[PDB]
Amino acid sequence: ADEERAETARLTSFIGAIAIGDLVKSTLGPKGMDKILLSSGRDASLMVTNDGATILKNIGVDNPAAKVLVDMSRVQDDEVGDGTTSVTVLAAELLREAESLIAKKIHPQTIIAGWREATKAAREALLSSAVDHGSDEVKFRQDLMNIAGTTLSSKLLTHHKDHFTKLAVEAVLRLKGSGNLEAIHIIKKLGGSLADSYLDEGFLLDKKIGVNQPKRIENAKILIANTGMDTDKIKIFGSRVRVDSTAKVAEIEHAEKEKMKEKVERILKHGINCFINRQLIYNYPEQLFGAAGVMAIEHADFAGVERLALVTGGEIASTFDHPELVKLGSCKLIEEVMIGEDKLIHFSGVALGEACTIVLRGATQQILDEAERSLHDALCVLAQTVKDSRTVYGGGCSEMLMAHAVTQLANRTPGKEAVAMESYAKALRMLPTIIADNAGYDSADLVAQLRAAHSEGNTTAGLDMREGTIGDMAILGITESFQVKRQVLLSAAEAAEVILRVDNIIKA
Amino acid sequence: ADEERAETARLTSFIGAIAIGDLVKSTLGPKGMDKILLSSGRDASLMVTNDGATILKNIGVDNPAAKVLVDMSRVQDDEVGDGTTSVTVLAAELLREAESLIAKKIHPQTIIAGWREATKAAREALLSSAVDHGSDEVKFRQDLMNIAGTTLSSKLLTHHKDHFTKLAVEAVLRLKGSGNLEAIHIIKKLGGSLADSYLDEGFLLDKKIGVNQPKRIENAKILIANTGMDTDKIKIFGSRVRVDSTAKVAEIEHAEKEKMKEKVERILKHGINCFINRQLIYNYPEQLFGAAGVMAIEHADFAGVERLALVTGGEIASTFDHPELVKLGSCKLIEEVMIGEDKLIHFSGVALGEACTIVLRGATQQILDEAERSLHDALCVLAQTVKDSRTVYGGGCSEMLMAHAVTQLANRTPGKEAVAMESYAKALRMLPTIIADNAGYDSADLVAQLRAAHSEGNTTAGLDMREGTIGDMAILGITESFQVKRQVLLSAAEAAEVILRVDNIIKAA
Amino acid sequence: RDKPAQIRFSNISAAKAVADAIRTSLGPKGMDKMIQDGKGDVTITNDGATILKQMQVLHPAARMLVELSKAQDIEAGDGTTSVVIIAGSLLDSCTKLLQKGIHPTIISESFQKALEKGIEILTDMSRPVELSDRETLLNSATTSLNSKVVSQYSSLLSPMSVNAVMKVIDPATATSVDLRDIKIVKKLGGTIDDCELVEGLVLTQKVSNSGITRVEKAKIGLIQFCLSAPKTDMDNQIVVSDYAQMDRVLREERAYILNLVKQIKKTGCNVLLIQKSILRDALSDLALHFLNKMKIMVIKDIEREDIEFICKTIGTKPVAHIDQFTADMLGSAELAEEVNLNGSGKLLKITGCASPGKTVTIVVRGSNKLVIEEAERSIHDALCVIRCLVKKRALIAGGGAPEIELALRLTEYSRTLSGMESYCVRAFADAMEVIPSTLAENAGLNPISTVTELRNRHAQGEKTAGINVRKGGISNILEELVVQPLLVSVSALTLATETVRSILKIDDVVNTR
Amino acid sequence: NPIQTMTEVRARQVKEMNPALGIDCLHKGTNDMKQQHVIETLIGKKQQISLATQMVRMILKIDDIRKPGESEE
Incomplete structure (x- = not known):
């Protein structure tokens, strides 16, 4: 039958997965924007969908790029939580980044192993910002309040966020571990x-x-x-x-x-x-x-x-x-x-x-x-939260510090993967940009100066886009159990590096 | 007279002026590869250039933004001598940035803004890589012999330069502090x-x-x-x-x-x-x-x-x-x-x-x-080298130095200014790609290593297009005088910044 | 990319023209629609308040407005066009604001901020009028009924609407007198003159013929029980091959059940609402007429309406097989009355019963259902506008007129906000002047005399008043007897705000397979 | 943002009146038309208005837009 070759197999890698990456990221992070799923195929109706898997699953996957990230990021959300966006969007941004490095054509082993080391370095740089709020069981209750409170965000609810803010706490708090x-x-x-x-x-x-x-x-x-x-x-x-x-x-x-x-x-x-x-x-x-x-x-x-x-x-x-x-x-x-x-x-x-x-x-x-589900994704992070209470103060204030710090790890450390650990650092600030215009703030001073700023130890002050302003992510409670920000980058960059490793798609 | 608004003129600005920065960067370095000179409209007789100024003088270009570079090319080539093919590409290097930045919603006002301050950040890092050699006459002798024939490198006839530069340094050795x-x-x-x-x-x-x-x-x-x-x-x-x-x-x-x-x-x-x-x-x-x-x-x-x-x-x-x-x-x-x-x-x-x-x-x-033609541009640098006796470490060395400097400054700035200033020192990092890729050797290896080398900071190991690989700038003769660089660092970002304020172009042509 | 804009623009485009083709409203405007459908079917439609729901439109935002068309109709029942006419009034600013450098998010709370401040000012132009007042009921019904089908039978319907509400009235400025509460039933025969307000629960069932109970002493219906008989629930080993043995099975089947129905009348039951299910045949046609031999009102396959209202009012549950007799879960009934006016219609009237302090059951009659529906939808919307005045006690300018009052004054709040959305407010604060001039749309020649005046007619009247859109002549928009409770208009703005704000988040291309 | 910086002095004009401080021609972070030192003759602004508001009305001059078919050539 048929075999797709390096460019196209890497191009087809970038067409579907970046597409489905563009769909849900309007919602992802803080909320300056949401995603709506037009349903003409199954009905004549409309579906308001902030839900990654919903936009993943209701869109049939013919694409070896889209099938993967719809498969991957679902398991990402099935395990870590709010992961249908995570692997999809983050890899999509990296599949955008894989393009040029493949376009300007470093040999892929760089583009492979550069972000490989960098995804760690991302986690690493953000593993520094990971801090337990589990100090007291009432503070951990509050650590369960902000972490779950962050996970309930961007997912359309009414009082259910307020109901399942504490009830996600209540469930894992009396069970004492393994939010379920x-x-x-x-x-x-x-x-x-x-x-x-x-x-x-x-x-x-x-x-x-x-x-x-x-x-x-x-x-x-x-x-x-x-x-x-x-x-x-x-x-x-x-x-x-x-x-x-x-x-x-x-x-x-x-x-x-x-x-x-x-x-x-x-x-x-x-x-x-x-x-x-x-x-x-x-x-x-x-x-x-x-x-x-x-x-x-x-x-x-x-x-x-x-x-x-x-x-x-x-x-x-x-x-x-x-x-x-x-x-x-x-x-x-x-x-x-x-x-x-x-x-x-x-x-x-x-x-x-x-x-x-x-x-x-x-x-x-x-x-x-x-x-x-917004409960479940909390439960997933709340299964992480008792194991690791580390609450890393997010919005991109967590994410772009990696963009800042991995750049440091990009500049000196790797020989030809410097550009790669730089290219990987780019996606780390990238949703902060696409959520910045959503709430109407300068992406740049945010994703440029503040990543430097909040890497100075300003990690507290962070990115909340409902607004267009910088705010403390300890007081604003946008943060989660840092295991939520690790496995996502892993199966994200991987799902980007899976199809980045792909120079042939053989279609039988 | 037809008004060119932002992207119309600006793309037209990029396509010519960056390609004008290309066939000249095709000549950038002695292993900047020979460009057969195919003249426009007259003189089918063909020289073959290792220096892009020829193309600029030989080949006329219809792009008005590109009509600017040939003059800026001649600014260097006449006033500063060497730095001619280079002043054209670094602007294009900064233009390649504004390719995004404009379509990336960044207004060319801001695009100048960082490059306003960023121009000195490299200058100052290249003031830091500016160190006086030639502080002694024997130094000055070899400091001339350094950047005298270094002016003659990309310029097509680097061979009789042996006898030529000795002549060229002697006459300026005779000048003895007074350039004439x-x-x-x-x-x-x-x-x-x-x-x-x-x-x-x-x-x-x-x-x-x-x-x-x-x-x-x-x-x-x-x-x-x-x-x-x-x-x-x-x-x-x-x-x-x-x-x-x-x-x-x-x-x-x-x-x-x-x-x-x-x-x-x-x-x-x-x-x-x-x-x-x-x-x-x-x-x-x-x-x-x-x-x-x-x-x-x-x-x-x-x-x-x-x-x-x-x-x-x-x-x-x-x-x-x-x-x-x-x-x-x-x-x-x-x-x-x-x-x-x-x-x-x-x-x-x-x-x-x-x-x-x-x-x-x-x-x-x-x-x-x-x-x-190879005589006076040296003598241009030489009289400069006379008045300021000094060097800067070329071959991407101070480039990447300035690159790692301004970028880490673009990392400590990073307001609207870094949007230009990160775009700025990347050019300082992108020109090291040019000579090494002219040398036909991976820059992503060398540059990103030269990065690391100048992320450690460096005055010495720099990309040697002679070796085609990263190598010492000790004042080996590939270490450039501070003379041309400051001028190019001044002259190059200009034509970029110049076109940055005028995207509006009214054309009755 | 480009994918979000176009379809979102198309969401603003395809839905706007639909919403733009809307406003012919308030009376004699345009020409009738005898509608060859998209399939060619030819259909006559008038009074587009109903045609909104009737209209069949595809496309995501365009079909959204028909689903948004009931939004005003679902809760209120008055001025159903009010949300659909403004469904394009927001789409007015939508294009500009997307094109103004203003984010769909900044446009999102823009609808809100315009909604927030809009319903605020509407309260100032809401004249509070007594929630239980016979007039504020009658006249709310009347004004509606004047616009609704019957303008004469209004004088019958309006008090019956009042009397139906005032029975179920839970006097409040909050939710009271629900639609599940008032039971509006239809009866062939009689007249709209003979449309009868009935305080007690009246079940509308199919009653077998007559010679059955119009009289007192009935144990209520809603029974699910089958009658166990040989060849029904009971084993008969009599084999059917020959015609005689095939004859022997029905006779024991028919002869036995007549004792069962006596046991059913022994329960005191003159009425059975029989489950639409079948336990085998449930009650056979043998059983049903035997029930009619006992004067027991019996409907096999009874409607769901008289199943729940008999649970809601009479408090009735199924009772067991009548050999097993009953748990007497049948609610209390006394008069089982089948009205035969010229014999037309089968109407089960329970006069006195268990009742939940509520559920007036109004029998809506006439020579035909068309004559009936002349009253029914009218009395309903009369009940509704009364319910709306029971919901919100007030009467505001009717027919979209106050939005032009809200237009100018929201343009002031365009300045008070002083925000990026204050411009958004400004664009829409002038987009509420559209309806009255646009209601005039479709009729005729030499057009423009209507347009900027209806704009200015409030503008010239300061922030006070302008011509009525449904009545006419220079006066107060608010006090006309074209009047609706504040609910209707604050409903419409709240309704179109959201669905049209969804458009702002409608993006890319995504379709369920 | 042309909307937001206009919103800036919009809120400011909902606050300050006849402002010596308004948006940035000089492109500063602070917007002070006195301390941006953007300085324009109130004659000029007035005359500009008189001149700027002028042309738009003037295209309405008489009812004749009528051309032989050449209004430009």
Whole structure:
């Protein structure tokens, strides 16, 4: 078939990945600008997207440049957080920088190993600016406030940043390391209060309970089972087929009613009031469950059970022949509440504790979903933050110091990679420029004098573009766990150096 | 008249003037490669240049911004001598910067702003690389011999420079603190060898009337004159050209002879043994000077009769307006003597002690006028080198030094000024690329190492286009005088800065 | 690159012409649209307040404005064009400011700063009028109803609108009297004269024929239960091949269910709203007519409207199979009334019931649904403008007129800000003079007499007043009886501000595959 | 920025009146029209206005833009 050659393979390396690098960087850093994703292909609509992966994934990747950075920077955001922009944008800037060095054509080993050493030197120079705010657990709480508060930025939210500013702290603070969600269960519904988010005791669910099954189930013993039916319950006797012909059509529709009545038996053997099964029923069986005495709460949810499992002591286990093999969560009450014109059901019996349930509210899910991701990217950096509390004061005040300091490491240290560690230093100030015009400040004195200035020990005073002014990134809280600014440069320059190493793209 | 706004003129400014900085940087360095001279509109006959000033003088350019450089080229080439191809490229080096800077939204006001201060930052670093050599005469001897022939390096004929620069330093060695290039009589004269190019102590004339006027004289009085003979100057000795009557036109000749003959007298009656005329001498007064013991040399060199007036102590006759009255040139020695293949009239005992005649002897005039083109630009630097005896470390050394200096200053400045000033010292770093890439050797190796070398700071290791690699500037002779650099550092950024204020160009052409 | 500008310009371009083709508004202007579609389908459209939603436009910012067209309509229900007419008033300044050396960010808060100060001044020109006042309800309805479909039946609808709101009124200058609350139901037959305000919950269902309950003593509907019978929920081993044994199955199926429906009437039920689902057939057509033998109002496949309102008002839940009888989760009902006025229409009226202190159910009638919708959308928007006056208690200049008052005065705040966006404000502060002259757009010959005057008509009236756009004659724009609560106009500005500010962040080229 | 430096004295003119200090012709960081020492006769500025505001009106002179077809050649 086909083989793409050095120039074009390096050109094609620069066409798609720099493109997708240009898309999200409008958002990245501080916010003087945002990105909007036009959707004409999947629909006729608009998607406001500050989200790297969204712009990465919703744009199909045919390009060995774009496929990589869409693949790389996603994993970058999947691990470090806010990394869909990181690898993509930073490499895109470097793929811009790889051009000229390849264009003026140093042999690539320079362009390869120059930034290789420089990416470290970048990290190194910025590893100097990395400082733990984890001094006190309340200061680390505040270190979790500014680091997560920085990670929540540029990602469109309403009160969700304020909710998940502390709740990202709360999750990793009581878990004490490894920012994740096992301790707060996110159950997202559309509520009346637009920006408001609140704690969910136990967890809540949706259903309308009519007929004989009472609308309320009191003193709830949750029997946790993955055993459930939909229309019917098939089993040893539950497997029967009457139809060889056109005669049994009217008869075969009779016995389906018994398969509705047969499963109701084995749970009465268990005798436990609340029986949670994950699967739907019809109403006529609901009429059969209501007279059973073992309450069928229709379509239970997984996360809320894990919520109960931690604080109550209950369990979701396998091989369910008996209640004994299932540890029983003890819940106060089970009620049908009418919330809006939708009728809801709620479980209780716990107060916060080891786990929690978080229930978001609003008109649409676009405000709800980006919250847990902006939470997640915090969680990723907050997984970094307990390990390394180092909070490096950013906006490019962290980034351009590398541009300043690596230039020092560029000038003397490398022989022919001086130009490379210079070329790598260029991208380090480059988003500070494209975010400077977004908030309307001189890129130059910023990316030129201030990188010298804030490298004098002015690292405090730093780059916040909502404004066009320089400000302290300890007081302005634009900063994160410095592991967020390391692995990104690594898989960024690499993803730039991956396709920089590429002089042939062989297309089969 | 059509108004050129910013990018229209400015791109047109770049494309010509940077390419004007290119075919000249193609000549930059002795291993700046030969450019066959393809002339524009006339003279298909082709020299091949290692010096871009030729191209600038040979090839005309339609770009007005490029029409500026040739003059700035000639600024160096005439005023400063060497630095000619170089003043053109460094501007282009700074123009390549403003390529971005303009399209990079930087207004040319700012683009000048840093380069305003940045010009001295390199100057001052090159004031730092300015160190006085030649503080001793032997130093001055070798400090000349340093940058004398160094002027001749890129300039196409660096070979007879062996004999030439020795001549060139000796005459300026004779100057002894007082630079006089008119006391050096420059005679480019065919015959003999090119290593037969010569330096007389005295004055000299390439003009020889012949041997029918006294050839050698001691204690000779030279009349320095525009005085005419068949030309019929003032003060009638007998009828000059006129018709006053029927036969008055006939009374001319015989009494014009007497007029020519008493224009011997007036001229002779100075007591001269030599009459040197920047104008015609008729054969009878000529030979009647030859019969008077007077050497009458016809239409003797304008600059010669002028330098003979300067070096020998002579006054021009005011064109015979001093028939007896003009102060003579006085040179105790008259020598009609063959340098090369031609008898040349040598004058010693002249008024000036620094008075000398450098006789450049063409074995061919193409090298001869080239010797003379390589002669004076040295002498330009030499008189500079005389007045300021000193060097600066070339071959990219002080370049990268200034580069690492101004850039790290562009690193401590870096306001609007560094936007120019980082653009500034990069040119100081980019010219080291030019000579080494002219040398056909990787600059990114050497430059970025020369960077490191001058990021350590350096006066010594610099890119030697002779070696094609980084090498010592100890004053090895590739260490340049502070003379040209300051001028180029002054002159180069100008044309850049000059076009920087005028992007607006109104063209009725 | 160039990619952001063009499409963002196109976002300002393609949406503007749509927003520019908008303003014919307020009454007799232009000529009717009998619309061959982009597909060729021919469609007649008038009174473009509704045509906004009806308009089908593609392109990212252009379809945005139809989605922005409901933005005024969704919450308010009055002056639906107010956001769409200004959808291009911001796009006015958009081009210039992008071209002025002003950043889309500096243009972004520009919309805000112009929005912030705009709704501020509108409060000064908002004349607060009593939230519960019959007039400020009636006249808000009237003025709207005057512009809405029926100008005569207004005198019926306006008090019914008042009476529907004043029933559900939660008197406030904040959110009250929601749209989920007031239940607006339609009934074939009667008249708009016979359109009946009904305080109690009236479910609109398909009731089988008559000889059923118009009378008292009914246990309410909304039942999901099937009737278990042989050949329904019960096993019959009677095999069907021969016609006789195929006949034996339906007869036991039909003979049994009539006892079930008696048990359903035994519950006290004269009404069943039957689930639109089917447990098998759920209630068969055997069961349904047997229900009609018991005078039980029964609709198989009932609408979702009477499912939730019966939960909202009567507090009703499904009850079990009637052999299993009921949990009596059916809410309290007493009068089950099917109005037959000339027999037209099936209307379930529950007079007295559980009620959430709310949900007036107004039966909207007429000779036809067209006559009905003459009242319904009118009474709705009458309710709405009343709701708007319940939402915001005030009446401002109607029809976009106050924006020209807001025009001049925002040009003053163009100076007070003294910012880079003060220029942006300035460009848009003069871009709110466009609508009244532009509303005149489309009709006819010798145009220009309308234009700069409507600009000046407030300008000449200082910051006080100008001609009304919907009425006419030199007067106060504000006090006309063309009047809308402050909500409608501060809504419109808030709505167009955002979606058009998204354009500023619309950049490059990105498309979901 | 032509908008921001105009915004500069805009805020300043929302503050100071008849300012001796205004934006930079001399291109300084401070903008003081007295201490930039940009100095122009108030006659000239006045006359300039009179002269600068002049031409634009003058293209309106009579109703005749009418040309034989040559308004320039």
